[PDB]
Amino acid sequence: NSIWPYNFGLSCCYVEMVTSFTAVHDVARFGASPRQADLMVVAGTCFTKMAPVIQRLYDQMLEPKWVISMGACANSGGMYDIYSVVQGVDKFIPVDVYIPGCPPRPEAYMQALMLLQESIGRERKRGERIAVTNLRTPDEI
């Protein structure tokens, strides 16, 4: 129950979860650098220029460290299968929890924090989503 996330959000993912703390337990109540960090959150596109920065910020934090890869750009390339973008943060950093979306909703980050802390202390969620009869039609609000 003690995580101080060092949000390394680069692109529109960053300004989408600009209010990530809102859904947080320990932060926002006192009692901010990778030298004293435990959780890194890679959110924006992983370019071929920011990659050394990301890797050194990973090697600066100490071993009890978990990284969360938010968005579809940090996970695997993205829509940007381009010459100047590394095709996933896991290409050079061992990721712990992946989150899909472009960009993911802050609820996704909240749930990712919960799902990662449950690792320390679709198949499992398929029945609910698979069998829903009907949906609200796109004609109202």
Partner 1 sequence: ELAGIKDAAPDATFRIRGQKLAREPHRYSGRTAMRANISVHEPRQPQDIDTMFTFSMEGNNQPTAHRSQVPFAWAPGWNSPQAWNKFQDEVGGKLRFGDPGVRLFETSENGLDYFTSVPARFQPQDGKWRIAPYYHLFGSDELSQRAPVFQSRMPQPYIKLNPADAAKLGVNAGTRVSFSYDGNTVTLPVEIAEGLTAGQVGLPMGMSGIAPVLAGAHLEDLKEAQQ
Partner 2 sequence: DFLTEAHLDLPMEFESIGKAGSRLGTALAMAVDHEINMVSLVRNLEEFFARESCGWCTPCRDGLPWSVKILRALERGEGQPGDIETLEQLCRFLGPGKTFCAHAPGAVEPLQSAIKYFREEFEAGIKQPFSNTHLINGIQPNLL
Partner 3 sequence: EPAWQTRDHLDDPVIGELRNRFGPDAFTVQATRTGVPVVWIKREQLLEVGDFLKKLPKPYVMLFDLHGMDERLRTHREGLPAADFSVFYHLISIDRNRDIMLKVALAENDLHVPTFTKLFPNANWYERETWDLFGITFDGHPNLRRIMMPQTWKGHPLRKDYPARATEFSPFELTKAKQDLEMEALTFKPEEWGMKRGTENEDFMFLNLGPNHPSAHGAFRIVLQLDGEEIVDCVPDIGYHHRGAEKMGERQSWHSYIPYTDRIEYLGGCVNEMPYVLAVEKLAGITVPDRVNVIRVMLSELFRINSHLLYISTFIQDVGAMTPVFFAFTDRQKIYDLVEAITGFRMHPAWFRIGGVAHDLPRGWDRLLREFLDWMPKRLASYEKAALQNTILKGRSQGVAAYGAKEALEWGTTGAGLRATGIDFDVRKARPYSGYENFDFEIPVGGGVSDCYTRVMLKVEELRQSLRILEQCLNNMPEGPFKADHPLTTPPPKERTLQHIETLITHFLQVSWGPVMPANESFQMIEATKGINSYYLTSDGSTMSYRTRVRTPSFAHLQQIPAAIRGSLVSDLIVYLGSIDFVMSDVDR
Binding site for partner 3 (CB under 8 A): 8, 10-12, 15-16, 18-19, 45, 47-53, 55-56, 77-87, 91-92, 102-103, 138-141
Each residue 85-104 as x (binds partner 1 by CB under 8 A) or -, in order, gives --xx--x-------------
- Pick the binder of ligand SF4 from 17, 39, 41, 45 (CB under 6 A): 45
Q: Does 128 bind partner 1 (CB under 8 A)?
A: no
Q: Does 121 bind partner 2 (CB under 8 A)?
A: no
**Whole-number minimum distance, CB 134 to partner 2, in Å?**
11
- Is the distance from CB of 73 to CB of 45 less than 8 angstroms? yes
Contact segment (CB under 8 A) with partner 1 among 32-40, 80-88, 112-120, 123-131 equals 80-88
